[PDB]
Write an enzyme that holds these catalytic residues in place. Sequence first.
Site: not given
Lengths: 12, 12, 683, 683
Positions: D375-379, D576-579
């Site tokens: 996916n766009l986040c690679s996980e 889990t960038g901004s949270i």
Amino acid sequence: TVEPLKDDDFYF
Amino acid sequence: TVEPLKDDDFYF
Amino acid sequence: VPKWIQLNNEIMIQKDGKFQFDKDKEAVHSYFVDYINQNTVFFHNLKEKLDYLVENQYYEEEFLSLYSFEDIKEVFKTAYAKKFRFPSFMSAFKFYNDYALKTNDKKKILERYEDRISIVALFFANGDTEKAKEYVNLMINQEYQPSTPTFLNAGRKRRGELVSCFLLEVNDSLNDISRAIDISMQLSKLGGGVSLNLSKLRAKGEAIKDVENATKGVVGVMKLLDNAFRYADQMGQRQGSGAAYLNIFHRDINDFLDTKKISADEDVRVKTLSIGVVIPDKFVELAREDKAAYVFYPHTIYKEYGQHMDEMDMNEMYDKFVDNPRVKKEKINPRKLLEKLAMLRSESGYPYIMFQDNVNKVHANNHISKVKFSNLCSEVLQASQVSSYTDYDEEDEIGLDISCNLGSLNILNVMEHKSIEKTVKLATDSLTHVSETTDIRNAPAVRRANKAMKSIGLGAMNLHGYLAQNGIAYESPEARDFANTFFMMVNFYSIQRSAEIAKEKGETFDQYEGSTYATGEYFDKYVSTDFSPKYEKIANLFEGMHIPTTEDWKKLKAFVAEHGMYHSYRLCIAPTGSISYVQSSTASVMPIMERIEERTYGNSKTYYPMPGLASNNWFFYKEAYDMDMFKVVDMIATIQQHIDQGISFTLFLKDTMTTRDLNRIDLYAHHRGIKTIYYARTK
Amino acid sequence: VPKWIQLNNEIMIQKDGKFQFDKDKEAVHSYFVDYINQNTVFFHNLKEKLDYLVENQYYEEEFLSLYSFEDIKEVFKTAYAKKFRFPSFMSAFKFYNDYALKTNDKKKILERYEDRISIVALFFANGDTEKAKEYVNLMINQEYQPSTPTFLNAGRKRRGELVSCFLLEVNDSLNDISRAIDISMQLSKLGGGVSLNLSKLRAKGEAIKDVENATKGVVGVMKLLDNAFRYADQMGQRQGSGAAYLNIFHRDINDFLDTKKISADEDVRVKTLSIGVVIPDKFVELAREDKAAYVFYPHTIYKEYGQHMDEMDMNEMYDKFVDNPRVKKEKINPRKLLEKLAMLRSESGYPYIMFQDNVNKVHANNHISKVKFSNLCSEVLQASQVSSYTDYDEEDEIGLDISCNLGSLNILNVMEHKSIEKTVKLATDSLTHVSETTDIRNAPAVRRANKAMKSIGLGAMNLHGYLAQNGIAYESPEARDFANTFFMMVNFYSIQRSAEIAKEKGETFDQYEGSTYATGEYFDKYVSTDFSPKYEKIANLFEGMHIPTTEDWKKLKAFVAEHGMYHSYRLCIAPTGSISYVQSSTASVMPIMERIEERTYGNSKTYYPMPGLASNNWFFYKEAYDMDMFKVVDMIATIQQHIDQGISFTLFLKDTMTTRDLNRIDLYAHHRGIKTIYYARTK
Ligand SMILES: Nc1ncnc2c1ncn2[C@@H]1O[C@H](COP(=O)(O)OP(=O)(O)OP(=O)(O)O)[C@@H](O)[C@H]1O
Ligand SMILES: Nc1ncnc2c1ncn2[C@@H]1O[C@H](COP(=O)(O)OP(=O)(O)OP(=O)(O)O)[C@@H](O)[C@H]1O
Ligand SMILES: Cc1cn([C@H]2C[C@H](O)[C@@H](COP(=O)(O)OP(=O)(O)OP(=O)(O)O)O2)c(=O)[nH]c1=O
Ligand SMILES: Cc1cn([C@H]2C[C@H](O)[C@@H](COP(=O)(O)OP(=O)(O)OP(=O)(O)O)O2)c(=O)[nH]c1=O
Ligand SMILES: [Mg+2]
Ligand SMILES: [Mg+2]
């Protein structure tokens, strides 16, 4: 910088 | 060559 | 350098101060004898050639299976009996480089002109041998030229669609935009040019689901469409070409126009998308009075009234929109916008100009819809209805798209043979067959509209050629008189053929009863006015040909009222560029751009004099850039009064002309009833 | 300059040689007392507030109506009973500037942290008041954090989709490409990141309908996708984000990578599209032996074998492709390609690296399909089945498109509360509810795969924060020991909850019978190996918690065999960038990038020390760039052995590291079992 991969770079 | 309409170009 | 090319280049070598025009016949003869005969595959008989072409996946076997081989042989003999000879090198070169069927390696020639004509005639006749012979006589006499798609692809297994012009309505929604992109890609994959109406899309800064300033406007959709056309560029053999149309009253009009500025940023600039503007009479009236004008946000109007801005009468609803507080609008300077259009056309030739009220004041199918935009060539003017494409697993509301298959009458050949009626009726039959056999399975609106409206475009070419070869100046009143009479006759016979087809098939086009043909309002000017030539010289040109009178038009009106019409639209004069060389004719009804055309093919430069050009008719072959564009507008308006669709009208401008001159030409064309203006060409 | 900003900026003002970390509690206190308490809309009681929120189209009334108002009041009281206090200014600032509900004019705060948590808990419970109270305790304790989409949008009428990760398979056809563009725009409109697999598209220079050198390759489709993602910018606040994945053995791989070069031409550059490469073990083997490799034209393989190149095992099919004359291939240097990948990742951080064999040697659903891209986040690593989008009026063959809703355990808070099992099970229940309440109306394959697979992603965060706040080096063996034990327990309890859900609902995920869960091959290492901590220090951290043994894993294996598994995928560690700010936790399982995070908001700059940062634990908060990337790879591989999906793994590189260092890091990650590599971040 750019340096080539040697054969030993594929073994650990 | 930009030139403005002169209020007579609309009448024929 | 090829020997034929050296012979052709001798055209320009002046001898006795005169061009060596006879060198082109020698050039064409040398071209044939040295290249075409050598590279033409040899077949012992026609039966063997047909078998080889069918088995090797060159021809569609289905259409050839409707004739006994005796009938096919008779048709081919009819095509060959004429002993047709190309009069110039460029005609044969164009045919054998573009339309002549070649082996899969493009090394040998499998089709001659007679072979292609016979195959097209057999495809048209749909199993009728006498009809096939009539088509062969029509095409070999060069009285009628099927459009490039039909001429090239008819009877070929590995062929694109025979219809090459499509118009797509786009609804204001993401589903509709995505479907529009998909349909444009599907249609460009087929080789057809796609024109999209973007007037129903909301302007930049409009709300998307009660969130304000969310919309990108028509320019974002324009970038999407430009990339889609660039991707589906016909396998690289011909770059995907599309046109976008925006009503002048759309708020994005200035951003829409700025996409064609050379100084435009690459992010906003659209490279491969042609743009046209739809100008209602309201905008021209506002510019004439110098009054401040307003451009409206389409979604606010849709929410306030429940209809799209381009679905409403601007001439009536403009004041209501301006006075409605719930309708968002932006103040503009109409004369500044007109001057911007003129400057943009001078710099790039864009946008196309569609005069909406000129189109719709004579539009026969306003009950179905008003004409909102044109095609990529600006000669298609038909009613369209926007489709509603919904979410997956929901039912789509399929509307009416626009598509017409084109054919051109060769005016010089039709007049020489005195066969306006027969040529027009045969061309109508062939165009009807092409429309009937066309089925696009990825453009539901296009397929539905083709099945319902049965629209065809019967064009004409060689108007300037025919006039110059008859000692008539293109700008003369006699030329306009001839055009009036000829196109009145063409319209009369196309209407008669449409009524005859409706009677034979016992079926008209969808919603015919509400058309001006059904009510008889279409024939008012024909039953009240006479269109016979007013000049004895022009009247002599029609000797041996019956010119329909007011009584004939009354009889045709009664016949149509009794039986109806098969075609919603019949006549449209497309540019007809590539096949004009094969026909040895001047392109469309436009005046010639240059007396002798200098082309480069490889490293060899070829010289093409205007067909029929000679010392005695040099003065009558006046170049378009030297003519008065007002007289060209007069000619096109004389022709346009007998065309139900539009005429692809190119403006030929000198570099000394200012933007004011271009604006004056546009305003005179709007005054003279011109419907669309195609290109602003500068010399 | 606001008072809270002044207090926060005092963090960097060293007093007595040490940072004034206590200024952050003062900064957050002042921030609240002077901005939040003032700008919070006042309601007399919970009833009035809820009525106002529902009436004004803020809260959906569907989920609130399932509870009697007494139940809602009890849940809200439970949320407020904790007296939760944000420990630092940045956490409260992030919450009340990104997630707190604000009036339509964005001037007042309608939701506190407790109100948002109570609304999310009520949405999760689906009518269960005790379940809602358990969710309130779980989130207020900050043991579990729902992903940004679920947390922000849950219970909101204007809310977008609670799922934000989408993977689409694109079939090699114009219909499929158009459908992919449409679906990408539809999903971006919902705010979710969209990842597409381009490995099935034929390479540039392939034939379309026996017409050679017609295909434009994956780069034209990439330009289309880039324009589509640019257009669907989600109001523009967050630009449309899309990722394209290509197999390394695809012919267009070099052109695919050239789109990310800064020197690349603008007509080829793809600005808004992230690119990932899928590297089978065969490519690494070829580069290791310095053997010449070949990139294949996918359509030739598909024609020769009737299956797509990326649907086959390259480790078994590479030699057959090379030896097959009907397969078209061009030679490449695998080591040169690896060096190019390293150079591109250094310059731009792209492409993402997916080690296909590392992913598929532990994939439990290879029977459904192998994992072909991420996916766009690679996980996200799940089986996908391509769809067959046919012509209009033709039925589509809907496949399986990947999607998962995300949640993160707070490792520090889960370990402090000794509630790994309960937190994991509650998070699994909430993720299952979010999955069951999702229905995508324009992504048929996404919706079908959501219904059939029931895939969820349960991540973790605060690994480095927890380790540093416990005197454990991130690179130390004890850190890997703790990660091993903790994520083994997480996997055990998530599998137990999935089996329990399957037993309660009586259904498993589609094609569960052929999975490694059903055959028991999944539990081999868990029934054969003990994953209890090997260090006394680590074993003490788990005191008070039952660590599953081989007997417990045998019992769970038998239970799964009896009842099956409800989820095809359960665990994935997203960035889990901004949270993470709201939870006052370090991001994901990665090491911290900076000890103190300096950021500029508006025209005032703010400082965010890593949670729990102090003089005593300053040295344990080692920055990632100062870390040995080999030890980071070791830790991620230790975690990855218990994650069924992937882990977003960013590489933190110093500017002095050559491309050889990056290549060695990638090779060691592949050697150690790393499935994907997300980003190459350089200091
Ligand atoms: N201008 C032309 N246009 C088309 N075909 C031509 C032309 N000139 C020659 N050809 C082709 O070349 C063939 C040989 O031409 P040529 O002038 O030598 O013929 P011929 O022996 O006089 O008899 P005929 O022309 O009646 O066949 C012609 O039969 C025709 O097929
Ligand atoms: N760090 C914080 N995080 C979250 N909310 C806070 C924070 N600081 C203050 N608040 C909110 O502001 C209110 C006022 O804060 P303050 O510290 O003055 O309260 P108090 O009267 O001392 O008692 P209490 O702490 O019980 O609220 C708190 O009740 C709480 O609602
Ligand atoms: C989704 C989206 C739409 N648009 C534009 C294109 C459409 O013409 C217009 C309407 O989009 P729609 O697809 O109609 O969105 P909607 O129907 O859910 O919202 P509404 O009720 O207001 O109609 O918005 C964008 O510019 N960018 C986008 O990302
Ligand atoms: C139509 C078209 C397709 N393509 C590419 C995209 C598709 O992945 C690929 C296949 O196109 P398709 O739409 O599948 O064409 P086709 O199925 O009719 O022909 P064939 O069976 O030989 O494939 O070609 C272009 O690059 N440009 C184009 O204009
Ligand atoms: Mg809409
Ligand atoms: Mg195909």
